[PDB]
Amino acid sequence: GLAPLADGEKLYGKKGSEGTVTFTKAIGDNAFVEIKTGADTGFMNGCLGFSESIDGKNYWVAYVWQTKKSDTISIDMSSPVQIAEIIGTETQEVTDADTIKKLTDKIKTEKSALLQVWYASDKTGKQIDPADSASESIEVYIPSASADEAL
Amino acid sequence: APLADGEKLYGKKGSEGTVTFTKAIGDNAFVEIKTGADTGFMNGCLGFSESIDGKNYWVAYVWQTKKSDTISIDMSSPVQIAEIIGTETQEVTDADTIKKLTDKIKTEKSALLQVWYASDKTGKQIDPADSASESIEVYIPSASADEA
């Protein structure tokens, strides 16, 4: 599961508020970000974002994606790239591989995520503000119970 | 000399949580939060992305609250600065880079408002975090007010 799936195998998440996406079952090991870029968009990136607590400490965890074209991006939920502890209104990189793995274990059980578009630029390399206006749609799915059975 | 009111230029809320204004954000932004009734704690951020000498950065100002409040946010004092390198990130501590970034940010007209974490009055996580608030707005000061 890192090849995009056929339509009937896509369990789409439902988009809410400050870009929350909510699913009817645990996210599991793979999510897929489907992007239709605007016709003058040269580049975009952003993340799926999670927050978790472990023994009284709070963490923000982000998986970064990017594209230069309409495409489906496979996100491996075992491989976060930004992990930070939120200590009051301050943050601190987490590098401890035990903490990271526990966070990912927990994230694999979550039913929702944050979808954010961070940065976008047009075909001349000039910034598109807000980044959001650079895409025509962004959606997120996970595989169906049936696709997962195929191991 | 606090405070307010009616000279609060609010920003319109977009989709992915973007919030946009009719003029540059400037030095201070105020996150206006109304907490939901079983909520003991919320945090999240205002975020921005900037490019500089063809590098891409993500910059975040974190707020938190334990109640209905207005958090003043200092645009000069971000707390999470990463350079985005492909699908990886790299923390920024260079003081000049931060300085350039904050300079650019202050001239933006839009920002990303995000709720990250939220907890019950029994420290029981609320999910999605967003659900723990009854209402979250941002304003900046009116240009009448700014002249003062």
- Beta-bridged to residue A20, according to DSSP, are A114
Tell me the chain B residues in contact with residue A60 when contact means C-beta distances shorter than 8 Å.
116-117
Tell me the chain B residues in contact with residue A66 when contact means C-beta distances shorter than 8 Å.
84, 86-87
Give the distance from CA B101 to its chain's centroid.
Answer: 15
Experimental determination technique? X-ray
Q: Give the minimum alpha-carbon distance from A8 to chain B in angstroms, rounded to a whole number.
A: 26
Cβ–Cβ below 8 Å for B80 and A84:
yes
Closest by alpha carbon to A18, among B112, B68, B30? B112
Judged by a CB distance cut-off of 8 A, whether residue A19 touches chain B is yes
Host H or E run for residue A10: strand A10-12
Closest by alpha carbon to B75, among B29, B109, B12? B29
- Looking at residue A9, what DSSP letter applies? G
* Resolution, expressed in angstroms to one decimal: 2.3
DSSP strand pairing (B8-10 vs B69-74): unpaired
Host H or E run for residue A51: strand A41-54
Q: Are B102 and B4 in contact (CB under 8 A)?
A: no
Domain residue limits at A8: 1-151
- Say how far apart CA A13 and CA A23 lie, in whole Å: 5
- Looking at residue A127, what DSSP letter applies? B
Per the document, the length of chain A is 151
Helix (DSSP H) and strand (DSSP E) numbers for chain A:
2, 11
In B60-94, which positions are buried (b, 16+ CB within 10 angstroms) versus exposed (e)? Answer: bbbbbbeeebbbebebeebbbbbbbeeeebeebee
Cβ–Cβ below 8 Å for B15 and A16:
no
Closest by alpha carbon to A49, among B89, B35, B79, B132? B89
Q: Are A122 and A41 in contact (CB under 8 A)?
A: yes
In chain B, how many domains are there? 1
Give the distance from CA B118 to its chain's centroid.
Answer: 16
Within the 98-137 window of chain A, which residues sit less than 8 Å (CB to CB) from chain B?
110-112, 114-119, 121, 125, 127, 129-132
User: Identity (one letter) of the amino acid at B138?
Assistant: V
- Say how far apart CA A12 and CA A72 lie, in whole Å: 13
Host H or E run for residue A103: helix A97-107
Q: Residue B43, CB half-sphere, CA atoms under 13 Å: how many?
A: 19
Catalogue the long-range contacts made by B89-98 (C-beta closer than 8 Å, 24 or more residues apart). Answer: B89/A62, B89/A64, B89/A81, B89/A82, B89/B58, B91/A93, B92/B57, B97/B52, B97/B57
Going from the C-alpha of A102 to that of each of A51, A92, A98, B26, the distances in angstroms are: 12, 17, 6, 40
Q: For the purposes of burial, counting CB atoms within 10 Å of the CB of A12, is it exposed (0-12), middle (13-18) or buried (19 or more)?
A: middle
User: Identity (one letter) of the amino acid at B135?
Assistant: S
Give the distance from CA B68 to its chain's centroid.
Answer: 16
- Beta-bridged to residue A50, according to DSSP, are A61
Closest by alpha carbon to B71, among B4, B1, B138, B126? B138
